[PDB]
């Protein structure tokens, strides 16, 4: 087997292969995540001749935890599958389900091991993992190709994620949080900065994941334009 050192330090102390993996994230479709009290939401940027279902970038990992991604879509699918495996494997080992922190730590740990083990280039993705814990607190974390992870109130990754995060930093008030409708409107406003061309899904307290179809999405497009 291949024992070559793929990821190494540079003259100025940079891990160039991890830095080039983060350039692969910044080309991928603009993914955005937002937290609330009762509800947690994810949304993604977008040909006429495609099945929307197959190129979906919002993926459930367990009954309580899902995620979005931005970057290389093939690289994403392996991290999602191995996350899905670890979610059920966690229940098999300790019965109780996975907290959003544990699965994020695992995805981070997996991403980090590819930046340091021989033969392997890093995963060219950043993820936005969301859900509800054992006690029922809502969560939103973010991983990146280096394998660092941090909790967020809201965050963006992908094309023009500076201009979306700049927008989110201002707009994330307690007024937008209160209701389930208002948190969803905030995600659409944020995506309308960079962007029928919006994928969008939600997670409530005890309930599972729920993708909103383009008919349901265009309802909230009317409710934004009034204001």
């Amino acid at each position: 087997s291949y024992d070559r050192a793929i990821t190494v330090f540079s003259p100025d102390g940079h891990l160039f292969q991890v830095e080039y993996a983060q350039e692969a994230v910044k080309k991928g479709s603009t993914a955005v995540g937002v937290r609330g009290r009762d509800i947690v939401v994810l949304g993604v940027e977008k040909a006429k001749l495609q099945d929307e279902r197959t190129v979906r970038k919002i993926c459930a990992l367990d009954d309580n935890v899902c995620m979005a991604f931005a970057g290389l879509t093939a690289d994403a699918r392996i991290v999602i599958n191995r996350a899905r495996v670890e979610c059920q494997s966690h229940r098999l080992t300790v019965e109780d389900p996975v907290t959003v922190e544990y699965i994020t730590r695992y995805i981070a740990s997996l991403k980090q091991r590819y930046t340091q083990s021989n033969g392997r280039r890093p995963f060219g993705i950043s993820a936005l993992i969301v859900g509800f814990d054992f006690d029922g607190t809502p969560r939103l974390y973010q991983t990146d190709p280096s394998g660092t992870y941090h909790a967020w109130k809201a965050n963006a990754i992908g094309r023009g994620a500076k201009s979306v995060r700049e927008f989110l930093e201002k707009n994330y008030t307690d007024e937008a949080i209160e209701t389930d409708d208002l948190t969803i409107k905030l995600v659409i406003k944020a995506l309308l900065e960079v962007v029928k061309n919006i994928e969008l899904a939600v997670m409530r307290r005890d309930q599972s994941l729920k993708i909103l179809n383009p008919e349901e999405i265009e309802k909230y497009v009317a409710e934004i334009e009034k204001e």
Partner: protein, 203 residues
């Protein structure tokens, strides 16, 4: 060996005898058959002493390692599951191990019978070891869900004492703990034969 455990209104009692026995000879009169994993988690012991000691110390290692990683104390369900998985990986190897994992977590008061085979049962009342059957008799007869703390201690103390009376391979001292919302408290390390002499003189 004789161990017992039961839930009631004011948390969970956990009482064990102290006799160790290589054959008919008494290896040791006073062995501690409860492990203290943390302030909110105990573990009773029966069967092979070395298996009991090693594998429940390894549970404790992983419970301690869970606290450092996650920044929160382990649940009673997860701890009981983790020990049964250790027993599942060593199935068919002649391990003899008959623990009950008692604790308190977010889910409430918790009690789990875990076994050498891989068995793992959530329940209100349990008993293990050779004196198993004799403990159940006294425990079940005098049980209520709404015992007082003192009446609960009287039940657990008597049940181990009358078990050691009949079972040859149980004896020495009753070691009774009491689980609460604010962690366990050691109730007593009472001598069994002094209790059996006391109950004889009451008639």
């Amino acid at each position: 060996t004789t161990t017992l455990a039961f839930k009631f209104q004011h948390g969970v009692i956990a009482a064990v005898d102290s006799r160790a026995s290589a054959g008919s000879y008494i290896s040791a009169l006073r062995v501690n058959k409860v492990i203290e994993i943390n302030p909110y988690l105990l573990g009773t012991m029966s069967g092979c002493a070395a298996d009991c000691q090693y594998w429940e110390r390894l549970l404790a290692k992983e419970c301690r390692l869970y606290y450092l990683r996650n920044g929160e104390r382990i649940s009673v369900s997860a701890a009981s599951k983790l020990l049964s998985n250790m027993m599942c990986q060593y199935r068919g190897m002649g391990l003899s191990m008959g623990s009950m994992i008692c604790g308190w977590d977010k889910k409430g008061p918790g009690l789990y019978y875990v076994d050498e085979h891989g068995t793992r049962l959530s329940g209100n009342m349990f008993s293990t070891g050779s004196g198993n059957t004799y403990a159940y008799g006294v425990m079940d007869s005098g049980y209520r869900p709404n015992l007082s703390p003192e009446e609960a201690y009287d039940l657990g103390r008597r049940a181990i004492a009358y078990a050691t009376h009949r079972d040859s391979y149980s004896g020495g001292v009753v070691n009774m703990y009491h689980m609460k919302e604010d962690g366990w408290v050691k109730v007593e390390s009472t001598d069994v034969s002094d209790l059996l002499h006391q109950y004889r003189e009451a008639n």
